[PDB]
Amino acid sequence: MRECISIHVGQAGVQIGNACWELYCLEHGIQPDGQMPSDDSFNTFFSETGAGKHVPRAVFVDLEPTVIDEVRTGTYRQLFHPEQLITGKEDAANNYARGHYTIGKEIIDLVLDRIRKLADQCTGLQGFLVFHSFGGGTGSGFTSLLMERLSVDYGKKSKLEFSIYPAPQVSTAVVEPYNSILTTHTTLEHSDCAFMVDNEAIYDICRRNLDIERPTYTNLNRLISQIVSSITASLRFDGALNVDLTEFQTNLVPYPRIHFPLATYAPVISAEKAYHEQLSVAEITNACFEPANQMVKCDPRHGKYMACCLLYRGDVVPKDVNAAIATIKTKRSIQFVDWCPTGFKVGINYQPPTVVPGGDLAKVQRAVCMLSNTTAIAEAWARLDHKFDLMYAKRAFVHWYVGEGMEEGEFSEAREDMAALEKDYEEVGV
Amino acid sequence: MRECISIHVGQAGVQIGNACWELYCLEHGIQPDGQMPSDDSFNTFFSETGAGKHVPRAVFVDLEPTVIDEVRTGTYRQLFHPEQLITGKEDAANNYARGHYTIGKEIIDLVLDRIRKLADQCTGLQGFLVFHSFGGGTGSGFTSLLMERLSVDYGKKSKLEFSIYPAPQVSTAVVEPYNSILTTHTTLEHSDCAFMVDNEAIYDICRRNLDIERPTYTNLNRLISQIVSSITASLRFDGALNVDLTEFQTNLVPYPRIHFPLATYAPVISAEKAYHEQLSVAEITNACFEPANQMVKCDPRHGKYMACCLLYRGDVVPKDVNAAIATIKTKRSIQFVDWCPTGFKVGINYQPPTVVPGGDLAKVQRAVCMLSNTTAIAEAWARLDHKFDLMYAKRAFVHWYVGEGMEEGEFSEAREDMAALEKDYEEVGV
Amino acid sequence: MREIVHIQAGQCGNQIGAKFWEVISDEHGIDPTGSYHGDSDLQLERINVYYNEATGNKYVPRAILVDLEPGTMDSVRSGPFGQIFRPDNFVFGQSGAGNNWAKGHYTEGAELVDSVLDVVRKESESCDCLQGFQLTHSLGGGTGSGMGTLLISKIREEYPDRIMNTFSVMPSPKVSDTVVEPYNATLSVHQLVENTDETYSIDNEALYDICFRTLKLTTPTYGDLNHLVSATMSGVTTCLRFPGQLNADLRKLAVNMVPFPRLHFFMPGFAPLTSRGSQQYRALTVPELTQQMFDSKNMMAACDPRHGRYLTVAAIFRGRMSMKEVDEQMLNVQNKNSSYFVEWIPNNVKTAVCDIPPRGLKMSATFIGNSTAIQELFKRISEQFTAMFRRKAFLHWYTGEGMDEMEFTEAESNMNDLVSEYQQYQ
Amino acid sequence: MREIVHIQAGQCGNQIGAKFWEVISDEHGIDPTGSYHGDSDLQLERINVYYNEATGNKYVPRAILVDLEPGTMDSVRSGPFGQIFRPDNFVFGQSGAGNNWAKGHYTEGAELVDSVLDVVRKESESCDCLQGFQLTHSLGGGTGSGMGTLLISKIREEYPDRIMNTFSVMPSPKVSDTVVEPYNATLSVHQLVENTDETYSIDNEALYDICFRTLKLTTPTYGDLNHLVSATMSGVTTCLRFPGQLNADLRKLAVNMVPFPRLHFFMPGFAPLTSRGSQQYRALTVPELTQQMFDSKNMMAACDPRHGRYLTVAAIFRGRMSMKEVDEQMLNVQNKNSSYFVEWIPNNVKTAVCDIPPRGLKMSATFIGNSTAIQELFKRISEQFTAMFRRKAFLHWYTGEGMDEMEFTEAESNMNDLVSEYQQYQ
Ligand SMILES: CC(=O)O[C@H]1C(=O)[C@@]2(C)[C@H]([C@H](OC(=O)c3ccccc3)[C@]3(O)C[C@H](OC(=O)[C@H](O)[C@@H](NC(=O)c4ccccc4)c4ccccc4)C(C)=C1C3(C)C)[C@]1(OC(C)=O)CO[C@@H]1C[C@@H]2O
Ligand SMILES: CC(=O)O[C@H]1C(=O)[C@@]2(C)[C@H]([C@H](OC(=O)c3ccccc3)[C@]3(O)C[C@H](OC(=O)[C@H](O)[C@@H](NC(=O)c4ccccc4)c4ccccc4)C(C)=C1C3(C)C)[C@]1(OC(C)=O)CO[C@@H]1C[C@@H]2O
Ligand SMILES: Nc1nc2c(ncn2[C@@H]2O[C@H](COP(=O)(O)OP(=O)(O)OP(=O)(O)O)[C@@H](O)[C@H]2O)c(=O)[nH]1
Ligand SMILES: Nc1nc2c(ncn2[C@@H]2O[C@H](COP(=O)(O)OP(=O)(O)OP(=O)(O)O)[C@@H](O)[C@H]2O)c(=O)[nH]1
Ligand SMILES: Nc1nc2c(ncn2[C@@H]2O[C@H](COP(=O)(O)OP(=O)(O)O)[C@@H](O)[C@H]2O)c(=O)[nH]1
Ligand SMILES: Nc1nc2c(ncn2[C@@H]2O[C@H](COP(=O)(O)OP(=O)(O)O)[C@@H](O)[C@H]2O)c(=O)[nH]1
Ligand SMILES: [Mg+2]
Ligand SMILES: [Mg+2]
């Protein structure tokens, strides 16, 4: 019942998985060895065997072994099914071309084989939670190949998309927009609701809120895990208003192509800071709409809200939710599209947030998960399109994509598709 | 009651016997000396004397002594009746010719003499379990001479055939197809149900499932022994649905000449792997039809199933068998011939599988023996016929067969017979 | 003897119906295990109205629990009185409706309607003389509004003559918790008007207004709103479970309360209502009950009656009281406030009195009203529908279920027709 | 006095008959060693019906255990009540039938029919007044279907006037465990229709459906299906072993239950049936027994009666009850469901009531039905036969036993003839 198969592609995907399962084993009380010391709250994410062992339903796919066989050496080496974590021989070279045609071709058939052997025990499979990065070669090419076959083998099943998106300023590779643009066909055609992750915005989040001067990506991971667990909170624990994963995405999506909502989490706050605040429902409600708390470097005040979903968890009373949202609709600075004078979807869960012992996040009795679609997010693509022009105008690095079996015009279809998406997110704002 | 005389011909036959009896003495609890420390469960395979000694009803026949007098030196030197294990003076030279006319002629009369002195104590003799290899000189020629006389002296008794069949790529001798083709008359005319064994497919099995990089043939043997014991499981132990050896072969055989079923065993799994799986009846049922688990390098998905026999053993409930076979008939990828919409024969036994202490196989509470006839297995002969042409087109090595008393045209009758068999297994698939 | 068969739809419906079961089990003195523990025999004669007699003198309520998710069934069975219910009436699917009316009415609930019908039919044949079906559900979301209307239509089809009364909690603008409520409400009232003989409209906002501005609760939870609903739930059927001087069962109300067949969405209310620290000071006399009863603050919907005219009002009083003051208040209310009651129909009040008051109460009053002002919620639902209808949002999640545009158009047209009839007589 | 001689054929037959022997030994209060241990004398007067009086006041059942393998004999003799049986009636071969009907009917069972006949004849001459033979066997495989029909034909030949009732577990498509069942079923029913006065059709799938969807057993084993069979096994012969107000022995059923001589394959059922945690809540009154009894879920074959018309139904009730409600339910069932019963024959029910209920039960009801819907299993068996008949598989294992093609053709023709007669009156 209510099972979800999590897919982890690329270095970013596999390591964000390492952090997510680190959070899940703690919140559901499983040791790193898979045992339960002493409700079926784990059936959503973990499978059970006769010996009392919790086996996650997850696949780690990387075209290179270093990160995954590092996982084979870490504390979670025995938690995972060893041959459901698949390693390739040749890295993706930050190239969508080989990852989509050349190197992922020989390995994808085993990946779908393991997906099938994960699906056949799920009696109530709810959806898919695939993790990757746009800029990475694996997270672009292999995901592009994989959602294609998943959409024809599991067409009815929902496919939530949690992807890591490049920053306006911070970047790790010059070819990142090339990988990002050929991913856009996958999210538009073979995804049901995509969640985009910006590293620089959350860098600002941890700089300002967590007061930590020197966090790593592991600190980024130990909050992406919270956002995904909060999205999955209603499926695993009891709540006064439990939101089904299908109910969720029906509430987000106004049109089949408009399914790209922003995400924010509250309260992101350090342990030294949690003490001096009462941390009411109202202020965590007010903090979410603050542009200084957005996960993507775009100003919501530059845009218009279409769908709003209040995913509260912990000791939160729905009356306080109504009182907060009355204030939210009271201010004019937050102007919603003329589509939704009802505005808000409310979801409340009884489980307080679970704290990572090595994390930088404080223990708070209340936590809220904010997921909202808005027209302001097109700016996060409005710099990437001008960016892609700035390389494609000479055919900057295409000889590699051409040399690995990509048609030259696939870039033309790519920027045509992103232009279509950018237009689609502008007409709905009128 | 329910006795079976096991025949072991050639090096492969005698050594697979050494492994089988190694398994049988452990599962029935007999020491290598033949004694019982402390039900008539052993009467199917072992004879009893007054002093409390278990004497196997088996013959080791090899035209050369090295392997058998090695058995005379091993831990089982005292288990066997010394002059029921027969040794020749001249090896078979991988040649069917001498083994069928020249060197086996002087020794076969003693072999049938010992077979008679093994038959005369069997009050309820059920059938024969003869082991050999197609490619070997002894396993071809001497078996060809022996089934001929057994079919006229024990015509009513069933003769199960467990033979080791060459691989599409892996081979140990150049003359192997020559020996294999002159064996085909024996299986068609003087055998009731033949079980073919491919070394390369099971090499892949032990490479993928057992995780062992460096097994020997002894690892091959310590699973052929399991397959034969599982086939004989119902005759020796109690079960809710015990399948008689005649009942078995009546369920396999649609026509007198179509009696060549494939075999697979589940769960083939290493000790480190047995822990993390619950290992339900369904998954061992699903694993058997997977082409990556077939004992012969042929794709069942390339062919059509005629008869299906579910030989479960251990802690298996028949309801779970019905639930599994409902799923099996649910998928379309497994298409059975229009002969058998009933599809499946079910056999359940209460004895869990017995583990070899030095083996590479894990201890599992449940085990299933899969035996099925299909039209896809003709491909395993569809490369051997083109193979035999590739030698016979010059008369490649016939001067030896001619020089040892074989008619030149016996090759012509041989490939005519294999062509007849190949046709026979194609018309039934319509 | 006038058996009444209860059906729960949606999480809202089954939890408020479960708390209603708790309340009337206390009124009838029924142990949580189902055994009888009441004090007087008066709790015992009309047990057959709500409960089935079984072995061991234990009593099982005649309730059918319907949902599309097992989680709500898990909560209700693990609730205070989960064990008293029938294991067979827990009829439920696995995949939820996702607040989709089309899912519940065509795909998700259509497969379970067969499994609910075979239970409701056996419950009805278990009855000696069936009177009707009291169904609890929510107009919000796609479970209660979706499958509830379908099975209501089915039971109306096969039971054409029995009383059909439904208590419906319905969406609201300021305390809306789901985006897609107006679609659900418009597609639900379409069937509610055509099939139901009786519908009680309940709005959450006025329940909140009651619990703050009258009950003075600092933290009234959702169960307190369930309690406010269950008070009138028990009140409306008091007369056919207990003796009283003026007996008025459901059809007694019906013949007096709905002038034209389609004007059957009504206004519930209950008295007395006090805070914890103010009940000590209040004089609970019947005239004061009346002055509290027709207050716009005592009602359970945002539709203020001063914006319309009452067609018919039902005041089912309860307790050991005489009745001349009952008549004098029921005439004074409609005389001094004759501008709020249709003068063209003179005596707008139906009076019923019961002899046994609620446990812990010396007296009680239950309010049922037909006001033309109830169109406030209907026209507002239609306006919000238009704000999400006129140019096509969210329709792919309905049309993907086989739903079609023209049926949405007819549903909106029927909302407009209803608000037209209710403004006609104002 | 109306002695009844039991014969077991096949492993299915002898194990279910052994568990039947266990059940009715508990009902008659017989110790596992064979001594009497019952409480009332009512268990004692009709001991002669099933058991033989012997020295020491111990009682040996009149059962003949027939098989072609010694393993089943070994299991039954080592079973809970193995010691009570006659060592002489363990008549058995050594080589099994291999699920071959021809083997059992021509070669393997023909040599043992002489050794079974000399035992059944001595058992019959040991009787004071023989009434019939109750034979348990399986239509699946070649032992129960194979030799069972042969010896049934022999006993019918030499006992032409005695009642012949057989309880036959018969093959099914989805819970089939053997490939060659349809041949066996077609070659068995050929003799069953011509010789047997009575045949009870039992299908394993509906036994599974009972144990999951009514009994709520998570792991109901094969012995639980044996128990479900043995319940009706004991019920059908209750009237001639115990007093009751309406006595109806086997021939009482026969004269009422089979309108034309060949329409004698019937529908067994038993009530009450509850899960462990639901018997505590159920009211075991006779009307509820009836509403459970004609349910399509209570039956023991996949043939849904709503796909046909009942010719005759037998309801042998048991326990200290009056009977006006018995008549009223037996008329209400055939009146409100008159579309499911042949209107052309008005009173389709035979009513029998016994005074002593089963041990631990205050009352019980046993269902026997003649529905035209029972052709569902017959035509499906014929269709599966055709899928393995029309172009020659598996026939070498029959024709090697002296079996011939034209007899298979006549067997299929007779299945078609039967399904024709049972569709004729639908
Ligand atoms: C000490 C004392 O006098 O306190 C009273 C009481 O009269 C007050 C405080 C009660 C009290 O009710 C509440 O506090 C309340 C809270 C949320 C929502 C609704 C009620 C009381 O709990 C409620 C309870 O009422 C009943 O028992 C009725 O029979 C009622 N049943 C229940 O309320 C009930 C409670 C728990 C479990 C099951 C039933 C009822 C009303 C209509 C129809 C059928 C039954 C009574 C007399 C009291 C307390 C205990 C404080 C009130 O309740 C009712 C329904 O009469 C709230 O306003 C009224 C009147 C009073 O102020
Ligand atoms: C405590 C209590 O009330 O439990 C009862 C009981 O009534 C229940 C649980 C019993 C119980 O039966 C089962 O659990 C069962 C399991 C698999 C297959 C069949 C039955 C009971 O075992 C069965 C047993 O019934 C009898 O003893 C009858 O005489 C029956 N004989 C046997 O079942 C039997 C059991 C063991 C050994 C020998 C006989 C019988 C029925 C028809 C004709 C002749 C005899 C009774 C009353 C009970 C228990 C003990 C729980 C039920 O059994 C019968 C046959 O009435 C199952 O549904 C019915 C009714 C009830 O739910
Ligand atoms: N937020 C966040 N982003 C990450 C993390 N790890 C990698 N990324 C993103 O991944 C992008 C580059 O992709 P890669 O590092 O090459 O990883 P990959 O997806 O496996 O791609 P390949 O190495 O080519 O196979 C960077 O721009 C980062 O934004 C992480 O831990 N947190
Ligand atoms: N699977 C398996 N095959 C074996 C084994 N031993 C021998 N064979 C097969 O035997 C074939 C060759 O036959 P030989 O090794 O010559 O044995 P032989 O049957 O005694 O023949 P001769 O030596 O000529 O008398 C090889 O191709 C192998 O496939 C074994 O232990 N396991
Ligand atoms: N008065 C009241 N309202 C509730 C309660 N629980 C939920 N609600 C509201 O009523 C609406 C009904 O929608 P819902 O029942 O969830 O839709 P469904 O799941 O399709 O049946 C929701 O939007 C809630 O905000 C309750 O206990 N009492
Ligand atoms: N209801 C029921 N069915 C059984 C039982 N045991 C076996 N069966 C099924 O009934 C069929 C009867 O065939 P079988 O008796 O084995 O053939 P036989 O050996 O020739 O008598 C088998 O295919 C089994 O699947 C049992 O205890 N109860
Ligand atoms: Mg990488
Ligand atoms: Mg050799």
GROMACS .gro file of C-alpha atoms in nm, chain D residues 212-316:
model
  105
 1498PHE     CA    1  -1.135  -1.617   0.252
 1499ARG     CA    2  -1.442  -1.401   0.186
 1500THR     CA    3  -1.666  -1.549   0.459
 1501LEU     CA    4  -1.443  -1.729   0.711
 1502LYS     CA    5  -1.162  -1.467   0.691
 1503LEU     CA    6  -0.890  -1.729   0.733
 1504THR     CA    7  -0.545  -1.601   0.642
 1505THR     CA    8  -0.404  -1.954   0.596
 1506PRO     CA    9  -0.691  -2.200   0.546
 1507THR     CA   10  -0.516  -2.526   0.463
 1508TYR     CA   11  -0.645  -2.824   0.268
 1509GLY     CA   12  -0.792  -2.970   0.587
 1510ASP     CA   13  -1.017  -2.665   0.616
 1511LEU     CA   14  -1.161  -2.742   0.272
 1512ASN     CA   15  -1.203  -3.100   0.394
 1513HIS     CA   16  -1.389  -2.957   0.695
 1514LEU     CA   17  -1.619  -2.750   0.474
 1515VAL     CA   18  -1.699  -3.064   0.273
 1516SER     CA   19  -1.753  -3.276   0.585
 1517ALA     CA   20  -2.000  -3.024   0.730
 1518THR     CA   21  -2.249  -3.094   0.450
 1519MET     CA   22  -2.140  -3.460   0.452
 1520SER     CA   23  -2.276  -3.486   0.806
 1521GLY     CA   24  -2.570  -3.254   0.740
 1522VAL     CA   25  -2.722  -3.443   0.447
 1523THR     CA   26  -2.766  -3.761   0.655
 1524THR     CA   27  -2.869  -3.594   0.983
 1525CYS     CA   28  -3.237  -3.694   0.973
 1526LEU     CA   29  -3.183  -4.073   0.977
 1527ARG     CA   30  -2.929  -4.062   1.262
 1528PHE     CA   31  -3.116  -3.827   1.498
 1529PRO     CA   32  -3.480  -3.745   1.570
 1530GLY     CA   33  -3.631  -3.425   1.435
 1531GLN     CA   34  -3.974  -3.285   1.373
 1532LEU     CA   35  -3.941  -3.325   0.994
 1533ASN     CA   36  -3.753  -3.647   0.919
 1534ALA     CA   37  -3.600  -3.653   0.571
 1535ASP     CA   38  -3.357  -3.934   0.495
 1536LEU     CA   39  -3.164  -3.967   0.171
 1537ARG     CA   40  -3.459  -4.102  -0.028
 1538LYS     CA   41  -3.684  -3.834   0.123
 1539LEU     CA   42  -3.446  -3.585  -0.036
 1540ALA     CA   43  -3.435  -3.786  -0.359
 1541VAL     CA   44  -3.811  -3.803  -0.417
 1542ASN     CA   45  -3.831  -3.425  -0.369
 1543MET     CA   46  -3.508  -3.306  -0.528
 1544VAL     CA   47  -3.444  -3.457  -0.873
 1545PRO     CA   48  -3.737  -3.387  -1.111
 1546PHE     CA   49  -3.602  -3.595  -1.399
 1547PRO     CA   50  -3.374  -3.899  -1.349
 1548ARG     CA   51  -3.059  -3.744  -1.501
 1549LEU     CA   52  -3.082  -3.401  -1.332
 1550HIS     CA   53  -2.904  -3.519  -1.018
 1551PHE     CA   54  -2.584  -3.310  -0.987
 1552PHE     CA   55  -2.655  -3.078  -0.700
 1553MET     CA   56  -2.535  -2.777  -0.505
 1554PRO     CA   57  -2.417  -2.827  -0.144
 1555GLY     CA   58  -2.388  -2.556   0.120
 1556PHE     CA   59  -2.380  -2.508   0.495
 1557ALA     CA   60  -2.463  -2.238   0.750
 1558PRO     CA   61  -2.364  -2.070   0.978
 1559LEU     CA   62  -2.015  -1.959   0.867
 1560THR     CA   63  -1.826  -1.683   1.049
 1561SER     CA   64  -1.472  -1.571   1.117
 1562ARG     CA   65  -1.325  -1.615   1.464
 1563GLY     CA   66  -1.371  -1.247   1.552
 1564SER     CA   67  -1.721  -1.212   1.404
 1565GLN     CA   68  -1.911  -1.504   1.560
 1566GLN     CA   69  -1.912  -1.301   1.883
 1567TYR     CA   70  -2.130  -1.038   1.711
 1568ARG     CA   71  -2.363  -1.247   1.493
 1569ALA     CA   72  -2.727  -1.319   1.576
 1570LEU     CA   73  -2.766  -1.687   1.485
 1571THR     CA   74  -3.145  -1.668   1.434
 1572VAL     CA   75  -3.294  -1.889   1.161
 1573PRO     CA   76  -3.388  -1.598   0.930
 1574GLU     CA   77  -3.024  -1.487   0.932
 1575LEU     CA   78  -2.923  -1.847   0.864
 1576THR     CA   79  -3.148  -1.831   0.558
 1577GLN     CA   80  -3.013  -1.499   0.431
 1578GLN     CA   81  -2.666  -1.652   0.461
 1579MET     CA   82  -2.778  -1.982   0.311
 1580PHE     CA   83  -2.892  -1.876  -0.036
 1581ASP     CA   84  -2.602  -1.631  -0.074
 1582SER     CA   85  -2.386  -1.702  -0.378
 1583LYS     CA   86  -2.083  -1.681  -0.148
 1584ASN     CA   87  -2.194  -1.969   0.077
 1585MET     CA   88  -2.194  -2.226  -0.205
 1586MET     CA   89  -1.914  -2.472  -0.285
 1587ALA     CA   90  -1.890  -2.436  -0.665
 1588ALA     CA   91  -1.813  -2.148  -0.900
 1589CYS     CA   92  -2.156  -2.182  -1.066
 1590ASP     CA   93  -2.330  -1.861  -0.964
 1591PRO     CA   94  -2.704  -1.938  -0.923
 1592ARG     CA   95  -2.800  -1.596  -1.061
 1593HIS     CA   96  -2.700  -1.732  -1.404
 1594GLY     CA   97  -2.976  -1.993  -1.391
 1595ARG     CA   98  -3.294  -2.116  -1.226
 1596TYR     CA   99  -3.332  -2.342  -0.925
 1597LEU     CA  100  -3.519  -2.664  -0.999
 1598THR     CA  101  -3.530  -2.787  -0.638
 1599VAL     CA  102  -3.359  -2.673  -0.318
 1600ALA     CA  103  -3.326  -2.873   0.004
 1601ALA     CA  104  -3.286  -2.694   0.339
 1602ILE     CA  105  -3.226  -2.948   0.616
   0.00000   0.00000   0.00000
